[PDB]
């Protein structure tokens, strides 16, 4: 409703770096809000794509940003009559970024790993890895829970059980208020998908450079499965947290699985022990139901509600014809211990191939009416196909069925405007929560400031 579309701010990064693939706000020890941006195709030392991270200070005129430096050198350790290897080439550092406290967590989902023992090997596979940083202090740490030293032969003898070689840890990420990092690994357990959690404080204290394989005893990974419904489901394509069990001492996890049950798609709510409390099945096959998940209380009853995006949903139209436009599902949490029923609201896109629902960002309370609001991206929507971000306002009955404001893309075609969103933070300190929108196709980020309501 009250996002300023006239006077935007623009940050930018190197060409072909996909600057803006992922972003998030970041407050320092003194509360100064900045913007962390991930550029997963930034050039490294060998003039090769490795990714990179930038920490943009707040400036109404935007501009260039300084780099948040991480080690980009490949590592090798000969230990235990074995040889450990890390390959950061095309790792995609910055394909996801998230902030918690004064710490930044940037991840390289496609960092490769291999172990050599004589003529055998573990296979060169993308286990993924995340890089943690405390900018003010300069502290650094890593976290790669899917690295292993098991040889290829062993996996064959065991029928490829608990195979964490293709995890891609960091594909998605989130951190609880308590400080528990939770990584999505949609390739873990032979493309079933796993989760991996660990306290940030324990990641830092248990990490040392050059070890490559170290233990984080406080960590906790999810479990393999024999059920074909989970085969090739990419469990962990998207991840979020919230409260869905009444008990406040516990934190519940939300996991997206856009290809669960033969490309039907599903989202599952779990406890911190990965025990499923509920499951939300897709409505249409290959709609990628679960591509994005958002958690926010939209009706102001204090109970977190759930939002799921199916960007490839094909709406039914006249003459028995389907039209890929996308869709978003709203699930309002019921009072006390009860199951999330059918969706309370169905928001469907309009632009063909627009991919409505590819991203869903909680905005907080934008118009300051008491109800929290959201933004839904259609990175290829709008009459031009350049992109669009639609704002939907909260009400006692859930969400408004029509958007209050539509942000058209200020970038050229193919910018993927809206592929990454983030809101519910007041960066200019005007008392209103603002919205940052990424456009990796144009290597830029657009900041929309919220202003007092005109009406």
């Amino acid at each position: 409703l009250n996002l300023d579309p006239v006077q935007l701010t623009f940050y930018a990064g190197p060409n072909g770096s996909q600057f803006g693939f992922s972003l998030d706000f970041h407050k320092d020890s003194h509360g100064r809000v900045a913007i962390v941006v991930g550029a997963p195709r930034t050039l490294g030392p060998s003039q090769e794509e490795t990714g990179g991270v930038f920490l943009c200070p707040w400036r109404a005129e935007g501009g260039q940003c300084p780099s948040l430096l991480f080690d980009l050198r490949d590592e090798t350790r000969n230990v235990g009559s074995q040889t450990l290897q890390t390959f950061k080439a095309r790792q995609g550092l910055g394909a996801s970024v998230v902030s918690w406290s004064d710490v930044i967590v940037a991840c390289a989902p496609w960092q490769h790993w291999n172990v050599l023992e004589k003529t055998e090997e573990a296979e060169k596979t993308p286990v993924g890895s995340c890089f943690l940083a405390q900018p003010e202090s300069g502290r650094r740490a890593e976290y790669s829970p899917c690295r292993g030293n098991t040889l290829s032969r062993i996996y064959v003898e065991n029928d490829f059980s608990w195979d964490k070689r293709y995890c891609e840890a960091g594909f998605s990420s989130v951190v609880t208020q308590a400080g528990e990092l939770v990584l999505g690994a949609p390739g873990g357990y032979y493309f079933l998908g796993l989760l991996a959690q660990a306290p940030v404080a324990d990641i830092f204290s248990s990490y040392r450079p050059g070890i490559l394989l170290w233990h984080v005893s406080s960590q906790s990974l999810s479990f393999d499965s024999s059920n074909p419904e989970y085969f090739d489901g990419y469990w962990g394509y998207s991840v979020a947290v919230g409260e869905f069990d009444g008990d406040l001492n516990t934190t519940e996890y939300v996991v997206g699985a856009p290809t669960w049950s033969w490309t039907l798609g599903a989202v599952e709510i779990l406890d911190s022990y990965y025990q499923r409390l509920h499951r939300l099945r897709g409505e249409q096959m290959a709609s990628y139901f679960g591509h994005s998940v958002a958690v926010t209380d939209v009706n102001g009853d204090g109970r977190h509600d759930l939002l799921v995006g199916a960007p490839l949903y094909m709406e039914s139209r006249a003459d028995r014809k389907l039209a890929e436009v996308g869709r978003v599902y709203l699930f309002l949490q019921p009072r006390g211990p009860h199951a999330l029923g059918a969706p309370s609201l169905l928001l469907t896109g309009t632009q063909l191939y627009g991919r409505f629902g590819s991203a869903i960002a909680p905005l907080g309370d934008l118009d300051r009416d008491g109800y929290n609001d959201i933004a839904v991206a259609a990175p290829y929507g709008g009459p031009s196909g350049r992109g669009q971000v639609l704002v939907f306002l909260g009400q006692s009955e859930g969400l408004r069925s029509r958007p209050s404001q539509v942000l058209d893309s200020p970038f050229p075609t193919g910018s993927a405007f809206g592929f990454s969103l983030r809101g519910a933070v007041d960066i200019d300190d005007n008392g209103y929560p603002d919205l940052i929108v990424g456009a990796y196709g144009a290597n830029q980020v657009a900041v929309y400031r919220a202003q007092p309501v005109v009406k």
Partner: antibody
Amino acid sequence: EVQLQQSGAELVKPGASVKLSCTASGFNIKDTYVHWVKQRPEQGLEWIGRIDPANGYTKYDPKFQGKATITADTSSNTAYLQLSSLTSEDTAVYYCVRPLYDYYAMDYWGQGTSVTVSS
Amino acid sequence: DILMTQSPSSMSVSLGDTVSITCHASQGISSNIGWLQQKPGKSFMGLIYYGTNLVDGVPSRFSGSGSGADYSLTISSLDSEDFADYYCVQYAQLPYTFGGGTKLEIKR
């Protein structure tokens, strides 16, 4: 806190077999490797072998192949070391070891189990 | 098998001194070394892992160093409890091999 409670001292006769144990306290034995080390006053410290209690695979120093046999039970959260065809040279204190962070380290040690072989 | 030549076998020193134990390998191990402490009539306690990293709970006066095939454990300002046995162990190759040992004896 991590602690490794090993079994009490053993006293057996030559030619017999003994099975030491290493129970884990404060954590899961399945977390890391579990090594076994032999200590004698004159010969000093010697590495027997290791086991991965998660899958059961083991590695041994060729000096102990046949004599030593390491096993583990995740249920009881305990790791075991069996020594067959005992002799006088098998008279030594045996420790179970695990790393702290580094997968291949030797940081935490049990109290040790004394073994005496004599008729 | 990698041989670990630890020296000296023993040394007589006093409190507050700064001593340095060494450990030589038969080949390079690239900091894949740990340092252990065995107080008399007791079990072992980890001090260092991977050449220089201290084990949690170990005083900061302890410190490891070195590279290649020569490493050194150093204790700044000895304490009454620091008089004990000390061993180096390599895990660069299986089987793990230990050093001879070093006994810190009180001087008088």
